[PDB]
RNA sequence: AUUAAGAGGGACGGCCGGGGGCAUUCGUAUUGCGCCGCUAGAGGUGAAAUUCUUGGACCGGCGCAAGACGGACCAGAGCGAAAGCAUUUGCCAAGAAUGUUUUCAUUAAUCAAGAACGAACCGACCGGCGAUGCGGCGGCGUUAUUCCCAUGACCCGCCGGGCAGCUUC
């Protein structure tokens, strides 16, 4: 009936991306 | 597709309040209440006052691409009475009328287990 | 018990002690020397009033220890008998470390034949080094003296020692060094502030001799210099009183130096030596730290707190007990010197050669031992003062700059010539400082410490040239790799408007750029190339050859990064780009999808309940990662009764594709049959049934075995095995005669638990343990391809390896949890070199899942039943009391093998990698030696499917049938086939009786054959063992031989076409 | 995979037998005629057999558990009729088929 | 002296209970506090008025702390000498009934005095019929199934001591 979340590990950004599936853009100089 | 919202219409006896959130409900788009349309504090509850306060709120959300709501009844609770006030009736209705689209209805009065 | 433990320790104190401390009999013995020294120093010519710049006096075979580079000098020289001969050091305090043993002696100065301002333009330093030049003469001749050797004392190249060693015996016993000294108050203390100057700026680099300038710049490290010869006397006196009178303190500081040692931080111009902990501990006498009353290990517990704690780069100490309104400041020695301690006397900085970097690696080294000191642990005093901790096998990446000569061109580039000018001439201890700090901010982010090598201490014999600052040896810079920090490929610097960014820009140069991001915000941004994940980790590299070339005019050319040369092992013939973790993540996201789609499937009579994988490519522990293929439909020929191909007389052998296992469970239920062999049926009719639905509604292509589905996905392959819960307990039912009926442990049994219940969990465990530590999967694979390379690959299991490999990750105490692969790799030679299998199980604590109460309760098993553990013993949270992982392990014979090989291979890799010019051969230790094996059986490489996994790489190969082009196949390929494993088993069944054999699985084209020597003895004629055996009738009585000339032929009839040639030796 | 085997051959007669001991030759296995695969050769075509068809799979699993079953509904059948029913001697067999339920012979009952 | 009371005492066997004590633990509600979003009101009444609010009240989200309480499941069911007793788990002692071809052999009943605890129509008036709680016995059949843990759920007949009904003498 119900389920609760108690400790998390640590952020790893690794991780998400296997469940989910930057440098930017260039800008001139003046 | 239709971009979807989440209001709360909370029904007291006393005063009726339209609150439109995010799927989230952390994010406030839009909150009017019964007593900025009536100058009396007599009517505050009525169903006009509510019907007023829900079609302000109903043009706000289509500027903003809001097409669909989702509706959360909740009444006062706790202690004291666990019946929709007045204005839920007319506030729901006037969404409607209003050209917004309706998901899924939901009441959220809190109910204690244990008695005081 | 808590006082067997702590006698425990007591005893292992004790017997460290006796081992480093020296005997009674060699006391008197040098006791006895130095009494001859006394005799003879004593007795020595005197020479007339010369000028110092007349040194044709001297007589050819000896030469000035100094170098002596502006030769202009204002003196006088006068030679005299020393007036005081006093034995100073640590060797009357009773604190001498066993390897080396040394004596110094103290020479005071007659008053009358030094001068007044003799402490200005190295006039002191001119006339102390003839002083030894005259001496060193005089004493070579001398038969008492076996060596007589010229050096630096204290790390000062304008310092010259003398050193004598006795003959013939005891010639390694001791040395001694000889150290003139001024008179006690020769010198004003207040005329060696590091803010005064005592060299002249005409006189150094000027012609002038009176050019108006600036005011003359500070001089604090000769400053230092001339006020350390005064103090000689000063520091054993105050010892005496302090040290002396308390035992124990002696254990803490003779432990302490061996800390030192282990650690290599006490030799070398600038390290942390045994002197300044004598200091260390006497401040903390003075405090209210330690007090006279503790034993040896309490001061090493209590020195290493403060070492951990305290930072003396900002904050400095002094051990002058008296606060006068005039007295130096501890500011201005901030000012001067990277490190501030203080004496009694406040000029005295006592330790201005040791440099920040080295005090924050000792910091660093610190607090690692505290956190094993207040673990409480068995073998924690083993690791703290008994593991080597090199610098080769202490970071993740090392770095060699090869001419230092460069380095001069570094400080022309930079602003040092005060600094320069005040150290004489010595260029490579100056930019050493400015160059670490230079490097750390700019590896803020990446790094977790930068350390560098310290130059070693010279040794040169007598009518020889000093050695040169260039000639010195070579610098080496050691990284620890920080691994949050390395995934990102960019420097984040400030936004454009306010204006640090300019800062940035100057920081950086050209490679700074503008950028833009999806959070809306333009930034000064830097953007290197790294693909892969090992090219990630070779981003320091661009970073300091970038860095040393911008601001130190230091050459890409002039820089040597020893990063992942290891990495080609694993790799393909050429592919250096990556090391194989973008393959196996493909491979585990098809894994994924297939236990996603079994989520679900529809029609089967019992759901799903658990998939699970029991494969090394799901764990990332494949050496070589798996790729998705395409069959060539002309290479093969086609049955066409089922879609399965099948390899051709004509064409070579096919590519090699093996199918990973996936074990699944289906739901519970009471309908299964109680009988052994009908549960084999029904799960033989699960394997069709799934292989029908799952082409059905997904169009895969599947064949169905009576133990297993192959199902192509994606061009992977996975071998599905369906388990039953019940089975292994249905195989224990064993109905005894008696009449009653038991449950007992079966070899089936046992291998059925392995293979369904066992496998999974470790698989699923690593896994997880990779997530934590990106470097685990290169390590492990580099260890089995070593192993596999010796040809010690039969004998142990792949699953063996890995809990090993995880046992660096999981409990590295000495060191930090690995970051690279060529630093796992090493030492994971050292634990299999230097670990006690007899008397100790390697501990693999995953996740947790066990506490100290639990580890010595294990512990106390094992020993209790040692003989029924097999000779390498594991133990893991999931199996205890038991390694199955071992139980058909290695023999006796080829663990003690690969110890051999392991302890002889670590020694030459280390020199490889250190040394400063590239390894000439990084595949040297990956070959096997090819000697002692009595038949080798060469193969053609053209059936060798796994031929491109060779260490040595053949440049040349054979058409496989595969398609370059991906897409789908709609057919099966060939799967686990390849002749040489096929001729292996073949090979150990006929004669694995009488015979060893010994192949390479990753590209070998030789096999060894090993006779059993009791096999080949003659025998009667029993029936059994008449498997290849012969009748002999030498003796007059029918006995068995071998046909050893039947075996041959054997050898070539078996593998037709595959075997090339058979040669037997002896 | 086959390694060092014995051999038990059957003859016609006994004739035969002693021929079999008198006979003396290379007796060579592979000829001409009778070639005998052996290598690559061989294990391409112990692969092709390797391959198994999913219908003669399946007719066999099917006939195994047709008998399986056959063999345990005559057992049930037997032990119902046999349930109570005592012999001669007065001996009454004590079975789970009954309505108290009863001590199993198992090592791990006897020492609970 | 005998027997071993449909007199009493003890022991043994498997169970049973919101019975008592000590620790441990969870659950919403309420209140208060901290931060984020939004902006003139919120609360209360028959109507108002005390109060709170631009220094952000009320409302929406997240998290933390404190004092109580233990719903629905909950029954004329169960337990205790009465007063009384309801989240989970561990521990300590106690007890009723039932089962018994065990043991002692009159050791008993009722009671002023005395002692422990203590909320805030009528009468031993023979019986009967149904359910109900626990324990035991027997049974055609269903239903799960026993490495450990556990041997039960339903239906029918029978014997006891209980909580109560409807009837009778
Ligand atoms: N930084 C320093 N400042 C002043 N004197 C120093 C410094 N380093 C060493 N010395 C002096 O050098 C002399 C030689 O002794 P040293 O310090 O080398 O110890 P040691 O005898 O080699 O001891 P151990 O065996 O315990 O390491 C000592 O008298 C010591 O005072
Ligand atoms: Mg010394
Ligand atoms: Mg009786
Ligand atoms: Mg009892
Ligand atoms: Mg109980
Ligand atoms: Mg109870
Ligand atoms: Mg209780
Ligand atoms: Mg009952």
């Given at each position: 009936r119900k389920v609760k979340m108690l400790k998390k590990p640590k952020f790893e950004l690794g991780k998400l991306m296997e469940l989910h599936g930057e440098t930017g853009a260039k800008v001139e100089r003046a | 597709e239709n971009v979807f919202g989440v209001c709360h219409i909370f029904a007291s006896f006393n005063d009726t309040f339209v609150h439109v959130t995010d799927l989230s409900g952390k994010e406030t788009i839009c909150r009017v209440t019964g007593g900025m349309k009536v100058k009396a504090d007599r009517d505050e509850s009525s169903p006009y006052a509510a019907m007023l306060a829900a079609q302000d709120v109903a043009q706000r959300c289509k500027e903003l691409g809001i097409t669909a709501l989702h509706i959360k009844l909740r009444a006062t609770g706790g202690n004291r009475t666990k019946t929709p006030g007045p204005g839920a009736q007319s506030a729901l209705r006037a969404l409607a009328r209003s050209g917004m689209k309706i998901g899924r209805i939901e009441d959220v009065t809190p109910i204690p287990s244990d008695s005081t | 018990?808590?006082?067997?433990?702590?006698?425990?320790?007591?005893?292992?104190?004790?017997?460290?002690?006796?081992?480093?401390?020296?005997?009674?009999?060699?006391?008197?013995?040098?006791?006895?020397?130095?009494?001859?020294?006394?005799?003879?120093?004593?007795?020595?010519?005197?020479?007339?009033?010369?000028?110092?710049?007349?040194?044709?006096?001297?007589?050819?075979?000896?030469?000035?220890?100094?170098?002596?580079?502006?030769?202009?000098?204002?003196?006088?020289?006068?030679?005299?008998?020393?007036?005081?001969?006093?034995?100073?050091?640590?060797?009357?305090?009773?604190?001498?470390?066993?390897?080396?043993?040394?004596?110094?002696?103290?020479?005071?100065?007659?008053?009358?034949?030094?001068?007044?301002?003799?402490?200005?333009?190295?006039?002191?330093?001119?006339?102390?080094?003839?002083?030894?030049?005259?001496?060193?003469?005089?004493?070579?001749?001398?038969?008492?003296?076996?060596?007589?050797?010229?050096?630096?004392?204290?790390?000062?190249?304008?310092?010259?020692?003398?050193?004598?060693?006795?003959?013939?015996?005891?010639?390694?016993?001791?040395?001694?060094?000889?150290?003139?000294?001024?008179?006690?108050?020769?010198?004003?203390?207040?005329?060696?502030?590091?803010?005064?100057?005592?060299?002249?700026?005409?006189?150094?680099?000027?012609?002038?001799?009176?050019?108006?300038?600036?005011?003359?710049?500070?001089?604090?490290?000769?400053?230092?210099?001339?006020?350390?010869?005064?103090?000689?006397?000063?520091?054993?006196?105050?010892?005496?009183?302090?040290?002396?009178?308390?035992?124990?303190?002696?254990?803490?500081?003779?432990?302490?130096?061996?800390?030192?040692?282990?650690?290599?931080?006490?030799?070398?111009?600038?390290?942390?030596?045994?002197?300044?902990?004598?200091?260390?501990?006497?401040?903390?006498?003075?405090?209210?730290?330690?007090?006279?009353?503790?034993?040896?290990?309490?001061?090493?517990?209590?020195?290493?707190?403060?070492?951990?704690?305290?930072?003396?780069?900002?904050?400095?100490?002094?051990?002058?007990?008296?606060?006068?309104?005039?007295?130096?400041?501890?500011?201005?020695?901030?000012?001067?010197?990277?490190?501030?301690?203080?004496?009694?006397?406040?000029?005295?900085?006592?330790?201005?050669?040791?440099?920040?970097?080295?005090?924050?690696?000792?910091?660093?080294?610190?607090?690692?031992?505290?956190?094993?000191?207040?673990?409480?642990?068995?073998?924690?005093?083993?690791?703290?003062?008994?593991?080597?901790?090199?610098?080769?096998?202490?970071?993740?990446?090392?770095?060699?700059?090869?001419?230092?000569?460069?380095?001069?061109?570094?400080?022309?580039?930079?602003?040092?010539?005060?600094?320069?000018?005040?150290?004489?001439?010595?260029?490579?201890?100056?930019?050493?400082?400015?160059?670490?700090?230079?490097?750390?901010?700019?590896?803020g982010a990446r790094?977790?410490?930068?350390?560098?090598?310290?130059?070693?201490?010279?040794?040169?014999?007598?009518?020889?040239?000093?050695?040169?600052?260039?000639?010195?040896?070579?610098?080496?810079?050691?990284?620890?790799?920080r691994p949050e920090g390395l995934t990102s490929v960019l420097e984040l610097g400030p936004e454009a408007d306010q204006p640090e960014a300019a800062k940035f820009r100057?920081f950086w140069?050209s490679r700074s750029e503008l950028r833009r991001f999806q959070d809306g915000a333009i930034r000064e941004a830097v953007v290197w190339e790294a693909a892969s994940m090992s090219q990630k980790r070779?981003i320091?590299?661009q970073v300091?050859?970038?860095?040393?070339?911008?601001?130190?005019?230091?050459?890409?050319?002039?820089?040597?990064?020893?990063?992942?040369?290891?990495?080609?092992?694993?790799?393909?013939?050429?592919?250096?780009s990556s090391?194989?973790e973008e393959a196996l993540v493909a491979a585990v996201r098809c894994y994924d999808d297939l236990s996603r789609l079994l989520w679900g499937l529809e029609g089967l009579?019992?759901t799903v309940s658990a998939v699970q994988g029991?494969?090394?490519?799901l764990?990332y522990?494949?050496?070589?990662?798996?790729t998705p293929?395409?069959?060539?439909?002309?290479?093969?020929?086609?049955?066409?009764?089922?879609?399965?191909?099948?390899?051709?007389?004509?064409?070579?052998?096919?590519?090699?594709?093996?199918?990973?296992?996936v074990?699944?469970?289906?739901?519970?239920?009471?309908?299964?049959?109680?009988?052994?062999?009908?549960?084999?049926?029904?799960?033989?009719?699960?394997?069709?049934?799934?292989?029908?639905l799952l082409t059905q509604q997904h169009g895969l292509?599947?064949?169905?075995?009576?133990?297993?589905?192959?199902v192509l996905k994606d061009g992977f392959?996975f071998?599905?095995?369906?388990?039953?819960?019940?089975?292994?307990?249905?195989?224990?039912?064993?109905?005894?005669?008696?009449?009653?009926?038991?449950?007992?442990?079966?070899?089936?049994?046992?291998?059925?638990?392995?293979?369904?219940?066992?496998?999974?969990?470790?698989?699923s465990?690593?896994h997880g343990?990779q997530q934590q530590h990106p470097?685990?999967?290169?390590?492990?694979?580099?260890?089995?391809?070593?192993?596999?390379?010796?040809?010690?690959?039969?004998?142990?299991?792949?699953?063996?390896?890995?809990?090993?490999?995880?046992?660096?990750?999981?409990?590295?105490?000495?060191?930090?949890?690995?970051?690279?692969?060529?630093?796992?790799?090493?030492?994971?030679?050292?634990?299999?070199?230097?670990?006690?299998?007899?008397?100790?199980?390697?501990?693999?604590?995953?996740?947790?899942?066990?506490?100290?109460?639990?580890?010595?309760?294990?512990?106390?098993?094992?020993?209790?039943?040692?003989?029924?553990?097999?000779?390498?013993?594991?133990?893991?949270?999931?199996?205890?009391?038991?390694?199955?992982?071992?139980?058909?392990?290695?023999?006796?014979?080829?663990?003690?093998?690969?110890?051999?090989?392991?302890?002889?291979?670590?020694?030459?890799?280390?020199?490889?990698?250190?040394?400063?010019?590239?390894?000439?051969?990084?595949?040297?230790?990956?070959?096997?030696?090819?000697?002692?094996?009595?038949?080798?059986?060469?193969?053609?490489?053209?059936?060798?499917?796994?031929?491109?996994?060779?260490?040595?790489?053949?440049?040349?190969?054979?058409?496989?049938?595969?398609?370059?082009q991906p897409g789908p196949?709609?057919?099966?390929?060939?799967?686990?086939?390849?002749?040489?494993?096929?001729?292996?088993?073949?090979?150990?069944?006929?004669?694995?009786?009488?015979?060893?054999?010994?192949?390479?699985?990753?590209?070998?084209?030789?096999?060894?054959?090993?006779?059993?020597?009791?096999?080949?003895?003659?025998?009667?004629?029993?029936?059994?063992?008449?498997?290849?055996?012969?009748?002999?009738?030498?003796?007059?009585?029918?006995?068995?031989?071998?046909?050893?000339?039947?075996?041959?032929?054997?050898?070539?009839?078996?593998?037709?076409?595959?075997?090339?040639?058979?040669?037997?030796?002896? | 995979?086959?390694?060092?085997?014995?051999?038990?051959?059957?003859?016609?007669?006994?004739?035969?037998?002693?021929?079999?001991?008198?006979?003396?030759?290379?007796?060579?296995?592979?000829?001409?005629?009778?070639?005998?695969?052996?290598?690559?050769?061989?294990?391409?075509?112990?692969?092709?057999?390797?391959?198994?068809?999913?219908?003669?799979?399946?007719?066999?699993?099917?006939?195994?558990?047709?008998?399986?079953?056959?063999?345990?509904?005559?057992?049930?059948?037997?032990?119902?009729?046999?349930?109570?029913?005592?012999?001669?001697?007065?001996?009454?067999?004590?079975?789970?088929?009954?309505?108290?339920?009863?001590?199993?012979?198992?090592?791990?009952?006897?020492?609970?």
């Amino acid at each position: 009936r119900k389920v609760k979340m108690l400790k998390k590990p640590k952020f790893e950004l690794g991780k998400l991306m296997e469940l989910h599936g930057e440098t930017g853009a260039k800008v001139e100089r003046a | 597709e239709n971009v979807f919202g989440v209001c709360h219409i909370f029904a007291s006896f006393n005063d009726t309040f339209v609150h439109v959130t995010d799927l989230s409900g952390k994010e406030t788009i839009c909150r009017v209440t019964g007593g900025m349309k009536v100058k009396a504090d007599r009517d505050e509850s009525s169903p006009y006052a509510a019907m007023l306060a829900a079609q302000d709120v109903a043009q706000r959300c289509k500027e903003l691409g809001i097409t669909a709501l989702h509706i959360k009844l909740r009444a006062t609770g706790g202690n004291r009475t666990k019946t929709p006030g007045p204005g839920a009736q007319s506030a729901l209705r006037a969404l409607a009328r209003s050209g917004m689209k309706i998901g899924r209805i939901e009441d959220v009065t809190p109910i204690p287990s244990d008695s005081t | 018990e808590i006082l067997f433990h702590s006698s425990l320790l007591r005893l292992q104190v004790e017997e460290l002690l006796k081992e480093v401390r020296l005997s009674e009999k060699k006391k008197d013995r040098i006791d006895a020397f130095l009494r001859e020294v006394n005799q003879r120093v004593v007795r020595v010519p005197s020479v007339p009033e010369t000028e110092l710049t007349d040194q044709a006096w001297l007589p050819a075979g000896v030469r000035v220890p100094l170098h002596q580079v502006p030769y202009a000098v204002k003196g006088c020289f006068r030679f005299l008998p020393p007036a005081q001969v006093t034995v100073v050091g640590s060797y009357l305090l009773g604190t001498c470390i066993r390897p080396d043993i040394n004596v110094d002696v103290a020479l005071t100065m007659p008053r009358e034949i030094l001068q007044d301002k003799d402490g200005l333009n190295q006039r002191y330093f001119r006339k102390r080094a003839l002083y030894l030049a005259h001496l060193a003469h005089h004493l070579a001749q001398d038969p008492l003296f076996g060596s007589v050797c010229f050096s630096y004392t204290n790390g000062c190249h304008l310092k010259p020692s003398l050193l004598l060693r006795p003959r013939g015996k005891d010639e390694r016993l001791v040395t001694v060094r000889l150290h003139p000294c001024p008179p006690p108050d020769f010198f004003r203390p207040c005329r060696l502030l590091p803010t005064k100057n005592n060299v002249r700026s005409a006189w150094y680099r000027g012609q002038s001799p009176a050019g108006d300038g600036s005011p003359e710049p500070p001089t604090p490290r000769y400053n230092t210099w001339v006020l350390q010869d005064t103090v000689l006397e000063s520091h054993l006196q105050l010892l005496s009183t302090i040290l002396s009178s308390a035992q124990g303190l002696k254990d803490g500081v003779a432990l302490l130096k061996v800390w030192l040692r282990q650690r290599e931080l006490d030799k070398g111009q600038g390290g942390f030596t045994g002197f300044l902990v004598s200091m260390l501990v006497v401040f903390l006498v003075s405090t209210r730290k330690i007090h006279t009353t503790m034993s040896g290990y309490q001061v090493l517990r209590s020195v290493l707190q403060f070492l951990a704690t305290t930072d003396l780069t900002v904050n400095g100490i002094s051990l002058c007990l008296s606060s006068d309104p005039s007295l130096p400041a501890l500011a201005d020695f901030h000012q001067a010197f990277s490190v501030v301690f203080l004496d009694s006397s406040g000029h005295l900085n006592l330790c201005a050669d040791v440099t920040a970097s080295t005090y924050h690696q000792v910091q660093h080294e610190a607090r690692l031992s505290m956190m094993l000191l207040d673990s409480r642990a068995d073998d924690g005093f083993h690791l703290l003062l008994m593991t080597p901790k090199p610098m080769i096998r202490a970071f993740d990446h090392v770095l060699h700059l090869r001419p230092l000569s460069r380095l001069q061109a570094a400080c022309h580039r930079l602003k040092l010539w005060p600094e320069l000018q005040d150290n004489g001439g010595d260029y490579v201890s100056a930019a050493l400082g400015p160059l670490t700090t230079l490097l750390e901010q700019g590896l803020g982010a990446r790094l977790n410490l930068l350390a560098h090598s310290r130059p070693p201490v010279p040794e040169w014999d007598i009518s020889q040239d000093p050695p040169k600052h260039k000639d010195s040896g070579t610098l080496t810079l050691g990284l620890l790799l920080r691994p949050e920090g390395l995934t990102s490929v960019l420097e984040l610097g400030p936004e454009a408007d306010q204006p640090e960014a300019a800062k940035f820009r100057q920081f950086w140069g050209s490679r700074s750029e503008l950028r833009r991001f999806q959070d809306g915000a333009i930034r000064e941004a830097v953007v290197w190339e790294a693909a892969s994940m090992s090219q990630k980790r070779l981003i320091p590299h661009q970073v300091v050859t970038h860095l040393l070339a911008l601001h130190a005019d230091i050459p890409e050319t002039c820089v040597h990064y020893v990063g992942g040369p290891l990495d080609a092992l694993i790799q393909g013939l050429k592919e250096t780009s990556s090391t194989g973790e973008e393959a196996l993540v493909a491979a585990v996201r098809c894994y994924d999808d297939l236990s996603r789609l079994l989520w679900g499937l529809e029609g089967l009579p019992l759901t799903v309940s658990a998939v699970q994988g029991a494969h090394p490519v799901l764990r990332y522990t494949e050496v070589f990662p798996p790729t998705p293929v395409r069959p060539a439909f002309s290479f093969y020929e086609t049955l066409r009764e089922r879609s399965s191909l099948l390899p051709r007389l004509d064409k070579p052998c096919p590519a090699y594709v093996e199918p990973m296992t996936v074990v699944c469970h289906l739901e519970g239920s009471g309908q299964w049959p109680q009988d052994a062999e009908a549960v084999q049926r029904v799960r033989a009719a699960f394997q069709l049934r799934l292989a029908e639905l799952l082409t059905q509604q997904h169009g895969l292509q599947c064949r169905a075995t009576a133990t297993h589905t192959d199902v192509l996905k994606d061009g992977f392959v996975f071998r599905i095995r369906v388990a039953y819960q019940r089975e292994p307990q249905i195989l224990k039912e064993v109905q005894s005669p008696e009449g009653m009926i038991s449950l007992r442990d079966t070899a089936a049994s046992l291998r059925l638990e392995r293979d369904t219940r066992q496998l999974p969990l470790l698989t699923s465990a690593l896994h997880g343990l990779q997530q934590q530590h990106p470097a685990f999967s290169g390590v492990a694979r580099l260890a089995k391809r070593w192993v596999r390379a010796q040809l010690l690959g039969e004998g142990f299991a792949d699953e063996s390896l890995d809990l090993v490999a995880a046992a660096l990750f999981l409990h590295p105490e000495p060191f930090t949890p690995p970051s690279s692969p060529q630093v796992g790799f090493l030492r994971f030679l050292f634990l299999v070199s230097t670990f006690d299998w007899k008397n100790n199980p390697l501990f693999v604590n995953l996740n947790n899942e066990l506490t100290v109460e639990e580890q010595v309760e294990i512990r106390s098993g094992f020993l209790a039943a040692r003989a029924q553990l097999p000779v390498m013993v594991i133990v893991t949270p999931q199996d205890r009391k038991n390694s199955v992982w071992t139980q058909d392990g290695p023999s006796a014979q080829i663990l003690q093998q690969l110890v051999v090989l392991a302890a002889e291979a670590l020694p030459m890799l280390e020199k490889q990698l250190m040394d400063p010019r590239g390894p000439g051969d990084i595949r040297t230790v990956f070959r096997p030696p090819l000697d002692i094996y009595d038949v080798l059986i060469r193969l053609s490489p053209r059936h060798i499917p796994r031929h491109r996994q060779a260490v040595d790489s053949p440049a040349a190969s054979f058409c496989r049938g595969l398609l370059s082009q991906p897409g789908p196949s709609s057919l099966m390929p060939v799967l686990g086939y390849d002749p040489p494993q096929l001729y292996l088993t073949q090979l150990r069944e006929a004669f694995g009786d009488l015979a060893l054999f010994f192949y390479d699985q990753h590209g070998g084209e030789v096999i060894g054959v090993l006779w059993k020597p009791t096999s080949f003895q003659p025998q009667p004629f029993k029936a059994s063992s008449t498997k290849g055996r012969m009748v002999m009738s030498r003796g007059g009585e029918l006995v068995m031989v071998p046909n050893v000339e039947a075996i041959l032929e054997d050898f070539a009839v078996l593998g037709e076409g595959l075997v090339q040639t058979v040669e037997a030796r002896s | 995979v086959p390694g060092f085997q014995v051999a038990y051959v059957v003859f016609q007669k006994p004739s035969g037998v002693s021929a079999a001991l008198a006979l003396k030759g290379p007796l060579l296995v592979s000829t001409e005629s009778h070639p005998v695969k052996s290598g690559i050769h061989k294990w391409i075509s112990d692969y092709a057999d390797s391959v198994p068809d999913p219908e003669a799979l399946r007719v066999e699993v099917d006939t195994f558990m047709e008998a399986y079953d056959q063999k345990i509904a005559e057992e049930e059948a037997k032990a119902k009729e046999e349930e109570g029913v005592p012999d001669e001697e007065g001996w009454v067999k004590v079975t789970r088929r009954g309505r108290r339920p009863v001590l199993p012979r198992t090592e791990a009952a006897s020492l609970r």
